[PDB]
Design a protein around this nucleic acid. Structure first.
Ligand code: MG
Lengths: 97, 106, 87, 95, 95, 106, 97, 82
DNA sequence: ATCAATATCCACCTGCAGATACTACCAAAAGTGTATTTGGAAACTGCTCCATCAAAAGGCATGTTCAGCTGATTCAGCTGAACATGCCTTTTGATGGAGCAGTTTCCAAATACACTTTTGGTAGTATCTGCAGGTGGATATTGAT
DNA sequence: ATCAATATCCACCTGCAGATACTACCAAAAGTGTATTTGGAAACTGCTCCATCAAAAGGCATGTTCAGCTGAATCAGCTGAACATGCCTTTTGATGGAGCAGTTTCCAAATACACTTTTGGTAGTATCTGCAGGTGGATATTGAT
């Protein structure tokens, strides 16, 4: 019977995902989500597959950067755990509200 | 029989750059030195980025520059990072960077 | 075409683990359980904004297909310029 | 089969100049292509505005020069400005 | 000596329809002028881009409309669009 | 002779707008309704703001609109505020607003 | 023998200054600072009166707004006292760092 | 009484700004931080304005020079022309 | 609670800075009639690539367990708010002169047009190679003790 | 420290994806050359409006005092990390047509040019007034007790 202490695998993952560049959201789910949202704006739409890929690359790059800012917001609050209040503070200061 | 690129000592295409200035409607008229000066700036910047990207390729024991290497080049250079501070390089990832307090012990 | 599958709740394909990976790339060590719904919301807003603009370009061109270029131009308007897809 | 142009061959020439044994992947080239188009558009735009602001109808190498100093940061600007001045001088004296 | 144009009088004419007993400071009018010039540039600019993306030599009302949709928030867009389509209708019919 | 504005029912100079579009290098060419549409949009937006800025004057017991009234109009409307979100109105001040935790205890 | 509690005048000044629009930096010191700074870019410069004015309106708008975000950052860390770190966090998240 | 011009941006003026921004209590170290920040702001904008001046072959920075600099730095200002 | 120090409120008054009004004016747009150039919807059809179906690769959902993080409590001490005014810097206003802006000139450089050549793209079919993803095998990191 | 479970790092290999290659070809380029148009530098100059400075205004540098804020120390409760376990969903590779995108004809529309009409900016002289800034006295707020 064996265990890592909480945070050890977490740092392992940070090192891993910061070293690579693969998209981290599964392709098909993300695709459906695109098509759903688009459909609500306009029916009988198609998408070049590179269009979806462009959205995915932009979406993940956006979210990854948001989590750095969020993570800096928790750390400012003497925490190491990101919470919704941190995301919100990030987005207010960013001018997303 | 000589191109304007070779006249200016440039690899980048002056005629092409002249043509693209006209059809982009930046102004009524386009002077003769403008596509020359611009084509050179373009060449200067792309050389600077390939130099640094090539180094990142070599630091990873690779021979083919891929987007990760372009991202490493840009983001590791203060001035390129600022010039491209609102741009996203598909397939580039991020820089390794863990904030201190997150590391183990004291 | 005959019939056309209904799309709903797809926001839930953005799974807890996929969101944790993005956090990780972003250098996050510890994640409150409320982060996942909040992140889904924020993603939904981001996509609505970019798709609206992208689809507006599609319609202005009188097309039924959203091109990579529609998305690239939408991304540029919104200050999130993307290289790698044609612009 | 409509001809789609890019800066790829020039990017490659310049690549061989600086790293003679290094290749570039097509995705990496795609981004290099985007980067050139992007900086072109941004310099050309500043130049456009600048001309208008000064009630000029013509974009000369002088307008491009200012657009470069406005758009690029310190050192990149200094050096870009050398190479553009150098190329225009050498262009004028070459006929 | 050189005549310095301004949207000021048109702003002032509209003030009076909207608030016939209300006036406006010098500084306030200058801001309203900036405002019109700014929105002008923003819309034209987006419209120019639209035409170019679509390899068109012309900026028609369709480009101005799409531009407005892209630039304006929700309700402002919608009312702006209807006021725009309105004025074009009225204009065509009028001899 | 009869002005294109009066034809279109507008207080805003269709002619000038037309001209300003040509000498703006926005495109090679410019359709006949584009300036009509554009000019209506500008009139519309101008009115909306004057409507609300006048309303602000009224509240503060004034008949002459000043910059402060444009600022209060713009930042108290969610949509105008978004459109003018990266714009500074000279001499506008800010909205009265104090974070609740900074209020003294009851 | 009468004194106001710490933070009572602070509130009073918030209400006062939020209500007005005068510039809050004295014109002359600002004027010199502008010139000093411009001297490193080109010597023997003159400034229209409206140019210096425009620079002041912009800087104060900027600083005022940066104090709003800064104050939000202090409040996030469960404080009421703005510190340099709060100004730093706000500037980092705004993408000025 | 020899003194740098940055220091003319005084404690009470910096306090007034804060106040307009809703700030109740202020660390002593803020005054130097705020001057640093203001200096960088002005550098970036003035650099660009002056560059407009040099372009127009002038020796006077116009308000339009400033307004144009502010626009491209994403700080569009209304009321001084343009 | 009361009591008093001081801030805040409302009303009324008043001089003038900054607004609206005005006519000449003339000059420069904007609009009106005639001849010219050009763009882009419609009609048509090759053919890319998007939507939509079945089989194989591995990540997701869920429950359990307890490490250690968060947020409450308390509390000492440090640090910023409040305070009085003579003192020194900024503001207000008075006056030469730098330079910006208005105007006219004329030519170097740009637009236009018409063969003439070069080249950058693709397409067809071939030919080469960097490295991703598999293996096994030697060394680092981590956590219990 | 010692032991060991597990992750991480090499190195070496091998199929094949995707990259570099090449030969045919060509349409759209870029180049060359001669004709005609003009934008803007250049040069004189008139008049703002900008720097400078004396006198008049008034905001701020000073140090003392202590309220109350920030941050360290401590602790319980419980959230979120790790991991084992059962399998659903995505991924990967191979077959039908909606719609994009490329050609061409043709008129509805925008450009051009020159003309004739008016509008909108300025200046001139004067014409007008909303309200900032000051008064007085009634009432609210804060803080001491
Ligand atoms: Mg739906």
């Amino acid at each position: 019977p064996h265990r890592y202490r909480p945070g050890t695998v977490a740092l392992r993952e940070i090192r891993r995902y910061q070293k690579s560049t693969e998209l981290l959201i599964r392709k098909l789910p993300f695709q459906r989500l695109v098509r759903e949202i688009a459909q609500d704006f306009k029916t009988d739409l198609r998408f070049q597959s590179s269009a979806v890929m462009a959205l995915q690359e932009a979406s993940e790059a956006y979210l990854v950067a948001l989590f750095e800012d969020t993570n800096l917001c928790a750390i400012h609050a003497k925490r190491v755990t990101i919470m919704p209040k941190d995301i919100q503070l990030a987005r207010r200061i960013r001018g997303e509200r | 029989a000589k191109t304007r690129s070779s006249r200016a000592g440039l690899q980048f295409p002056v005629g092409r750059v002249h043509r693209l200035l006209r059809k982009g409607n930046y102004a009524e008229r386009v002077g003769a030195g403008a596509p020359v000066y611009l084509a050179a700036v373009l060449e200067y910047l792309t050389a600077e980025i390939l130099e640094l990207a090539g180094n990142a390729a070599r630091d990873n024991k690779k021979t083919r520059i891929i987007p990760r290497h372009l991202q490493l080049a840009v983001r590791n250079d203060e001035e390129l990072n600022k010039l491209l501070g609102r741009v996203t390089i598909a397939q580039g990832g991020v820089l390794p960077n863990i904030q201190s307090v997150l590391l183990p012990k004291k | 075409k005959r019939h056309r599958k209904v799309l709903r709740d797809n926001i839930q394909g953005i799974t807890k683990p996929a969101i944790r990976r993005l956090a990780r790339r972003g250098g996050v060590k510890r994640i409150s359980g409320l982060i996942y719904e909040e992140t889904r919301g924020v993603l939904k807003v981001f996509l609505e904004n970019v798709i609206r603009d992208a689809v507006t370009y599609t319609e202005h061109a009188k097309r039924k297909t959203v091109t990579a270029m529609d998305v690239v131009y939408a991304l540029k308007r919104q200050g999130r310029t993307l290289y790698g897809f044609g612009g | 089969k409509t001809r789609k142009e890019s800066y790829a061959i020039y990017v490659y020439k310049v690549l061989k100049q600086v790293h003679p044994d290094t290749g570039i992947s097509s995705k990496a080239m795609s981004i290099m292509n985007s980067f050139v188009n992007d900086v072109f558009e941004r310099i050309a735009g500043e130049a456009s505005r600048l001309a208008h602001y000064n009630k000029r109808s013509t974009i000369t190498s002088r307008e491009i020069q200012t657009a470069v100093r406005l758009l690029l940061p310190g050192e990149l600007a200094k050096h870009a400005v050398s190479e553009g001045t150098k190329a225009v001088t050498k262009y004028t004296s070459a006929k």
